[PDB]
Design an enzyme around this catalytic site. Structure first.
Site, PDB file in Angstrom:
ATOM      1  N   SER A 142       0.808  -1.204   0.000  1.00 40.12           N
ATOM      2  CA  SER A 142       0.000   0.000   0.000  1.00 40.12           C
ATOM      3  C   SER A 142       0.843   1.257   0.000  1.00 40.12           C
ATOM      4  O   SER A 142       1.957   1.277   0.523  1.00 40.12           O
ATOM      5  CB  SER A 142      -0.906   0.027   1.223  1.00 40.12           C
ATOM      6  N   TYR A 155      -2.200  -0.877   9.933  1.00 41.45           N
ATOM      7  CA  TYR A 155      -2.211  -1.279   8.535  1.00 41.45           C
ATOM      8  C   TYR A 155      -0.987  -0.715   7.831  1.00 41.45           C
ATOM      9  O   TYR A 155      -0.229  -1.439   7.191  1.00 41.45           O
ATOM     10  CB  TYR A 155      -3.502  -0.793   7.861  1.00 41.45           C
TER      11      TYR A 155
END
Ligand SMILES: NC(=O)C1=CN([C@@H]2O[C@H](COP(=O)(O)OP(=O)(O)OC[C@H]3O[C@@H](n4cnc5c(N)ncnc54)[C@H](O)[C@@H]3O)[C@@H](O)[C@H]2O)C=CC1
Ligand SMILES: NC(=O)C1=CN([C@@H]2O[C@H](COP(=O)(O)OP(=O)(O)OC[C@H]3O[C@@H](n4cnc5c(N)ncnc54)[C@H](O)[C@@H]3O)[C@@H](O)[C@H]2O)C=CC1
Lengths: 235, 235
Positions: A142, A155
């Site tokens: 990401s 995350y």
């Protein structure tokens, strides 16, 4: 072009994983769909077979190291060889204030987004090496892996690690003809799963370390990195 | 300047942790030395007391979440309050080819260098917030956290996460008057533990996000970051 390649895709029953199953599949790859939702897997492979893709389904929680080992064995049983393409795409997240984060938040989110991909790497890397065939490994991380955040804290941290970890394995595995890439999507309107899938396949062909198909993030990334460089002590 | 501050330092029985115990101690801070080696702790606190520093010793493996909770309680018992300064300095490493890495290599190294600091954050952040006192949190990560490597793969990945994670907590905790920093030493002749300790204290005073007291790494860091920026898809 990918004919007689075997591709093992986590979280492949949906989103970017399924997109890759499709795009690699349409290029000639045999597909293994590894996902934790048994029903979604079943559906996903029916739909791949419907498209003329040879596809096998494996219900799997990548956080289970021994099942991940059973799977890898299963793959060799079905297709007669270890994968020549590994894609660590499975991911999960939840939003909230980073100070309010709990151990269970950490274990789940670090679990899937980092420990899952470690499990993927430890399981397959030796088998791919022992095959003595060229290969490739992609992790869909990401953009948040480049920059920590107060609402996606756990995350982002896991993704930062998986990016760094791929940077490492690229260096380690080049001598084995096995390329390594990491895709960092902008998930902080938005790039479609099949568009991202085609970007990934291109990166695999190009043997690119980074796959960042989002021209718009460049300014922000340059800024974040400069802030770090500016922190280096003179002289 | 740090008078009547309470500082909780992991891996404080040695190296950069002990340096910080000393430097913060000499500035007036009460010190808690948390380290896993009971003998080294004992020695470390004797030596701090010898220097006129009020210091308590806690034998602790930061990978044990419940002991980390006992410690935090212990600290409040001894000094009558939660720490106003948390330093996650404890670290470990081992070198070898990233492809040869094993689960135990991962669990140990990710365990200390990432899970340890998560445990540190989850344990103390709520207590520090509930104190309603200003505070600060430092994690000693590594320059390797900015760039994955084939010989320190697991270590670098964990450090990349702890950097990213601190980036996140800085944003989250600013509204609580609690600053957050991350120190990234160049451990890939070399900066002395007390020199690094003084750099960290300065960063704490300055409320700097990044503490990188190594002017020499700038060129390399700029290069690594440009390679990423160059990977962003046009246009
Ligand atoms: O769009 P996207 O980024 O794809 O998001 P997405 O939510 O659409 O797809 C994520 C995929 O990852 C899978 N997944 C979640 N936890 C897993 C686990 N523990 N083990 C294996 N697979 C797991 C989900 O089943 C899902 O299919
Ligand atoms: O120079 P340096 O960077 O300081 O390296 P160092 O090796 O000199 O110091 C590292 C410190 O971290 C500590 N440590 C290792 N594992 C630990 C654990 N599981 N829990 C708590 N402390 C631990 C060591 O005892 C040591 O005191």
């Amino acid at each position: 072009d990918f004919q007689d390649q075997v591709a093992f895709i986590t979280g492949g029953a949906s989103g970017a994983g399924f997109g890759q199953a499709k795009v690699f599949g349409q290029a000639g790859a045999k597909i293994v769909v590894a996902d934790v939702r048994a029903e979604a897997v079943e559906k996903a492979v029916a739909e791949l077979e419907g498209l003329g893709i040879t596809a096998h389904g494996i219900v799997l929680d990548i956080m289970d190291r021994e099942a991940y080992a059973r799977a890898a064995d299963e793959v060799e049983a079905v297709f007669g060889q270890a994968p020549t393409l590994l894609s660590n795409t499975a991911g999960v997240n939840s939003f909230g204030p980073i100070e309010k984060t709990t151990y269970d938040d950490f274990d789940w989110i670090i679990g899937v987004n980092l420990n899952g991909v470690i499990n993927g790497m430890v399981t397959f890397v030796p088998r791919m090496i022992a095959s003595g065939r060229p290969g490739h490994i992609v992790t869909v991380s990401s953009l948040g892996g480049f920059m920590g955040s107060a609402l996606a804290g756990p995350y982002s941290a896991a993704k930062a690690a998986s990016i760094n970890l791929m940077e490492g394995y690229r260096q380690g595995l080049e001598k084995y003809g096995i390329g390594v890439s990491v895709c960092t999507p902008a998930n902080i309107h938005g790039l479609e799963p099949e568009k991202l899938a085609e970007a990934i396949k291109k990166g695999v062909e190009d043997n690119a370390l980074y796959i960042i198909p989002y021209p718009e993030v460049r300014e922000g990334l340059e800024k974040h990195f400069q802030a770090i460089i500016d922190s280096v002590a003179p002289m």
